[PDB]
Enzyme design. Structure first.
Site, PDB file in Angstrom:
ATOM      1  CG  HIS A  23      -2.146  -0.871   0.796  1.00  0.00           C
ATOM      2  ND1 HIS A  23      -2.193  -2.259   1.454  1.00  0.00           N
ATOM      3  CD2 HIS A  23      -3.245  -0.758   0.108  1.00  0.00           C
ATOM      4  CE1 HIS A  23      -3.341  -2.788   1.023  1.00  0.00           C
ATOM      5  NE2 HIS A  23      -3.906  -2.044   0.225  1.00  0.00           N
TER       6      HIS A  23
ATOM      7  CG  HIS B  34      -1.615   0.133  -4.546  1.00  0.00           C
ATOM      8  ND1 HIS B  34      -2.241  -0.573  -5.369  1.00  0.00           N
ATOM      9  CD2 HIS B  34      -2.651   0.765  -3.835  1.00  0.00           C
ATOM     10  CE1 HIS B  34      -3.401  -0.683  -4.889  1.00  0.00           C
ATOM     11  NE2 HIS B  34      -3.880   0.161  -4.263  1.00  0.00           N
TER      12      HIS B  34
ATOM     13  CG  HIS C 189      -6.864   4.396  -4.135  1.00  0.00           C
ATOM     14  ND1 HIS C 189      -5.731   4.455  -4.716  1.00  0.00           N
ATOM     15  CD2 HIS C 189      -6.864   3.081  -3.414  1.00  0.00           C
ATOM     16  CE1 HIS C 189      -5.195   3.432  -4.664  1.00  0.00           C
ATOM     17  NE2 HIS C 189      -5.757   2.323  -4.288  1.00  0.00           N
ATOM     18  CG  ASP C 190      -4.758   2.469  -0.803  1.00  0.00           C
ATOM     19  OD1 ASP C 190      -5.891   2.491   0.089  1.00  0.00           O
ATOM     20  OD2 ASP C 190      -4.443   1.581  -1.336  1.00  0.00           O
TER      21      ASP C 190
ATOM     22  CG  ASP D 173      -7.910  -0.743  -4.601  1.00  0.00           C
ATOM     23  OD1 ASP D 173      -6.703  -0.549  -4.618  1.00  0.00           O
ATOM     24  OD2 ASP D 173      -8.534  -0.957  -3.649  1.00  0.00           O
TER      25      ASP D 173
ATOM     26  CD  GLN E 201      -3.781 -14.554  -4.752  1.00  0.00           C
ATOM     27  OE1 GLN E 201      -3.777 -14.134  -5.800  1.00  0.00           O
ATOM     28  NE2 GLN E 201      -3.885 -13.974  -3.573  1.00  0.00           N
TER      29      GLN E 201
HETATM   30  C1  LIG Z   1      -5.208  -7.627  -6.115  1.00  0.00           C
HETATM   31  C2  LIG Z   1      -5.237  -8.724  -4.921  1.00  0.00           C
HETATM   32  N1  LIG Z   1      -5.838  -8.066  -3.838  1.00  0.00           N
HETATM   33  C3  LIG Z   1      -5.942  -9.085  -2.933  1.00  0.00           C
HETATM   34  C4  LIG Z   1      -6.869  -9.305  -1.701  1.00  0.00           C
HETATM   35  C5  LIG Z   1      -6.529 -10.251  -0.969  1.00  0.00           C
HETATM   36  C6  LIG Z   1      -5.602 -11.374  -1.403  1.00  0.00           C
HETATM   37  C7  LIG Z   1      -5.571 -12.738  -0.729  1.00  0.00           C
HETATM   38  C8  LIG Z   1      -6.783 -13.681  -1.146  1.00  0.00           C
HETATM   39  C9  LIG Z   1      -6.793 -14.864  -0.098  1.00  0.00           C
HETATM   40  N2  LIG Z   1      -5.632 -15.471   0.146  1.00  0.00           N
HETATM   41  C10 LIG Z   1      -6.222 -16.532   1.020  1.00  0.00           C
HETATM   42  C11 LIG Z   1      -5.327 -17.371   1.951  1.00  0.00           C
HETATM   43  C12 LIG Z   1      -3.903 -17.378   1.732  1.00  0.00           C
HETATM   44  C13 LIG Z   1      -3.210 -18.500   2.542  1.00  0.00           C
HETATM   45  C14 LIG Z   1      -3.677 -19.394   3.518  1.00  0.00           C
HETATM   46  C15 LIG Z   1      -4.899 -19.282   3.433  1.00  0.00           C
HETATM   47  C16 LIG Z   1      -5.875 -18.442   2.815  1.00  0.00           C
HETATM   48  C17 LIG Z   1      -7.557 -16.391   1.259  1.00  0.00           C
HETATM   49  N3  LIG Z   1      -7.718 -15.237   0.463  1.00  0.00           N
HETATM   50  C18 LIG Z   1      -9.254 -14.613   0.357  1.00  0.00           C
HETATM   51  N4  LIG Z   1      -5.155 -11.414  -2.759  1.00  0.00           N
HETATM   52  N5  LIG Z   1      -5.329  -9.946  -3.282  1.00  0.00           N
HETATM   53  C19 LIG Z   1      -4.792  -9.693  -4.581  1.00  0.00           C
HETATM   54  C20 LIG Z   1      -4.039 -10.831  -5.520  1.00  0.00           C
HETATM   55 MG   LIG Z   2      -7.385   1.061   0.306  1.00  0.00          MG
HETATM   56 ZN   LIG Z   3      -5.614   0.520  -2.800  1.00  0.00          ZN
END
Ligand SMILES: Cc1nc2ccc(CCc3nc(-c4ccccc4)cn3C)nn2c1C
Ligand SMILES: [Mg+2]
Ligand SMILES: [Zn+2]
Length: 313
Positions: free
Chosen positions: A68, A72, A106-107, A217, A269
């Site tokens: 962040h 970004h 925005h951040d 974003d 992911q």
């Molecule tokens: C742009 C962009 N914005 C974002 C926001 C969040 C994430 C993490 C997404 C996720 N990893 C997990 C996870 C990972 C390791 C162990 C257990 C669970 C759960 N979940 C929902 N990726 N992301 C990207 C790529």
């Molecule tokens: Mg934000």
């Molecule tokens: Zn952002």
């Protein structure tokens, strides 16, 4: 006045594409932003001197966190540039002015922690702003910087045009709170499907800009695979530090934030692409057909994470 910004040839051509990576040369990022304002908005939108002073104060108010950060901010502004340039005639003069600024701001002053961590920590910002906590702060920091002497880039706007651009920026920044995105995309989906979507209706435009803000974003998932994959490392380096801080408060973090559960990143992911990213770019493509390359790139990256799980990388 007769003073353009011009980029080397490879950046001049590739900056028009949705998947453009702004590069590791931090000192070229202001020039890249000004270039985008000038083609997106015009050389007359902003006084060069005021705009350069605003950009440098915005940079100074982003912190040295893994994800962040200032890179970004400029990345999210570039995705918005690509959307605006592929949808020439759909947007007002005020919207072109407001949306690139909203994306750069925005951040602002992000600390690398979620709204949930501020609320569990009992951070003062969580008493000042009970929902969308960091996002109300980012808007507050944007207004602070616009009010520094020599920083009012909107000085030529009328009183009521100034109030409209600040209201576009406010709603655009609030919309980057991912908690708000799910309901916003559901309404947009129903509106599109029953044919009630109306771009002359201000509350409809507001929702459409909201979804553009989510798309910009999240644009890390629309890059070439090596960019997507290396950016995910920064994203998780923040979440894992928040997890460590949750454990310091005596709270088991969610698995997404627990470094002990690094192994499930590939499956995490997949859920993210299926639950958040793919739905986001699908509804955006339905409303704004020329944004389809973002959905195609997102789908290509989902397929790469599928290959990681199958141990083909
Ligand atoms: C742009 C962009 N914005 C974002 C926001 C969040 C994430 C993490 C997404 C996720 N990893 C997990 C996870 C990972 C390791 C162990 C257990 C669970 C759960 N979940 C929902 N990726 N992301 C990207 C790529
Ligand atoms: Mg934000
Ligand atoms: Zn952002």
């Amino acid at each position: 006045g007769l003073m353009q910004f011009t980029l080397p040839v490879r950046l001049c051509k590739e900056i028009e594409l949705f998947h453009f990576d702004i590069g590791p040369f931090e000192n070229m990022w202001p020039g890249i932003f000004v270039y985008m304002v000038h083609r997106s908005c015009g050389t007359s939108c902003f006084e060069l001197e005021k705009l350069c002073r605003f950009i440098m104060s915005v940079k100074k108010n982003y912190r040295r966190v893994p994800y962040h950060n200032w890179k970004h901010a400029v990345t999210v502004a570039h995705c918005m540039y690509a959307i605006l340039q592929n949808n020439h005639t759909l947007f007002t003069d005020l919207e072109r002015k407001g949306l690139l600024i909203a994306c750069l701001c925005h951040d602002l002053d992000h600390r690398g922690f979620s709204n949930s961590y501020l609320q569990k920590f009992d951070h003062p910002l969580a008493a000042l702003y009970s929902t969308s906590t960091m996002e109300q702060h980012h808007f507050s920091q944007t207004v602070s910087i616009l009010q520094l002497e020599g920083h009012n880039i909107f000085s030529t706007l009328s009183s009521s045009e100034y109030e409209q651009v600040l209201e576009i920026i406010r709603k655009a920044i609030i919309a980057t709170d991912l908690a708000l995105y799910f309901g916003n995309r559901k309404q947009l989906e129903e509106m599109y499907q029953t044919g009630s979507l109306n771009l002359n209706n201000q509350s409809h435009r507001d929702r459409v800009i909201g979804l553009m803000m989510t798309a910009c974003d999240l644009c890390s998932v629309t890059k070439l695979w090596p960019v997507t994959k290396l950016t995910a490392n920064d994203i998780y380096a923040e979440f894992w530090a928040e997890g460590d801080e949750m454990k310091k408060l005596g709270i088991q973090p969610i698995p997404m934030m627990d470094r002990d559960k690094k192994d499930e990143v590939p499956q995490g992911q997949l859920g993210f692409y299926n639950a958040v990213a793919i739905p986001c770019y699908t509804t955006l493509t339905q409303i704004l057909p020329p944004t389809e390359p973002l959905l195609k790139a997102c789908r290509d990256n989902l397929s790469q994470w599928e290959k990681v799980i199958r141990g083909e990388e």
